[PDB]
Amino acid sequence: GETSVPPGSALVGPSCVMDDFRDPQRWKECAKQGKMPCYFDLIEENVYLMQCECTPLIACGEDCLNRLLMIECSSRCPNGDYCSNRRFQRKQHADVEVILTEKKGWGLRAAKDLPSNTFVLEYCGEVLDHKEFKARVKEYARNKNIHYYFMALKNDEIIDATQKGNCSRFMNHSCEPNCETQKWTVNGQLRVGFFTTKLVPSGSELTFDYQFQRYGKEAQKCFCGSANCRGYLGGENRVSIRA
């Protein structure tokens, strides 16, 4: 039939908002209604189980010798409080919103235009050794978990955001993504964050190459929708030249 502009609609029962992830009571209420994802423990930093030459005034922009090596400045930066290269320390995350997708579960979207190489969010979680990782892989497989939340930090340390993390756990995989991870040194400790790899317009889902599952043994249908989607996520090997 003939379509028309819908009337204004105001919700009766109040809206669930991003600040509600820092309000356990309201989040648990929202989750019962399917208005927010299943509760998890929101953490501010990972749980474990260098002076640039910038002139004091962008403060520590693209030419900063720390930034170029993916090292954050300290409080002793020549730019002091105005240093722009302390984004993980100051939790200077992008304006993001959590969305419910048709096929992949929840996801993250940009709420403003994000230029290329914008810091989105730190990927926080429990940092596991190989023994704890192997135990939890078996635990989650036995539990028939639908979603995975592991990401390698270093050759002997895997971050697990299944139980504890932040909204970066909702990032979905795309075969043609608009974000990547970068591993930065902050006060001598490696931390990992999501960064855009192109300009991402306001309203766009943020996506990345989920390497942990992509090169894992088992596979699942890929719902990314990309023009050149590889069809499934998982069961792939990186390029090699054999014999």
Ligand X SMILES: C[C@@H](O)C[NH2+][C@@H](CC[C@@H]([NH3+])C(=O)O)C[C@H]1O[C@@H](n2cnc3c(N)ncnc32)[C@H](O)[C@@H]1O
Interface residues with Zn ion (CB under 5 A) are 52, 54, 60, 64, 73, 77, 79, 83, 85, 175, 222, 224, 229
Ranked by CB distance to ligand X, the top (closest) residue is 105
Task: Determine, following the binding rule CB under 6 A, whether residue 213 of this chain makes contact with ligand X.
Answer: yes
Cβ nearer to ligand X, comparing 118 with 174: 174
- Here's the x/- map for ligand X, 146-185, by CB under 6 A: it reads as xxxx-----------x------xxxxxx------------
What are the backbone angles phi and psi of residue 52, rounded to the nearest 5°?
Answer: -75, -175
Whether 175 contacts 226, CB under 8 Å: yes
**Least distance (Å) between residue 155 CB and Zn ion:** 27
Structure tokens at 6: 């819908």
Shortest distance, position 173 Cβ to Zn ion, whole Å: 7
Residue number, 39 or 82, with CB nearest to Zn ion: 82
Q: Is the CB of 182 or the CB of 220 nearer to ligand X?
A: 220
Question: Rounded to an integer, what distance in angstroms lies between the CA atom of residue 118 and that of residue 201?
Answer: 12
| Only segment of 24-32, 60-68, 110-118, 220-228 that touches ligand X (CB under 6 A) | 220-228
Nearest Cα to Cα of residue 163 among 126, 195, 205: 126
Q: What character string, x for contact with ligand X (CB under 6 A) and - otherwise, covers 1-40?
A: ------------------------------------x---
Using CB under 6 A, count the residues that bind ligand X: 23
Bridge partners (DSSP) listed for residue 179: 196
**What Cα–Cα distance (Å) separates residue 199 from each residue in 67, 112, 133?**
20, 11, 35
Nearer to ligand X, 74 or 99 (CB): 99
Q: What is the Cα–Cα distance from 197 to 185, expressed in whole angstroms?
A: 20
Picked from ligand X, Zn ion, none, the partner binding residue 149 (CB below 5 to 8 A depending on kind) is ligand X
Q: Are 117 and 197 in contact (CB under 8 A)?
A: yes
Give me the DSSP letters along 88-114.
Answer: TTTT----EEEEE-SSS-EEEEESS-B
Amino acid at 36: M
216 in contact with ligand X (CB under 6 A): no
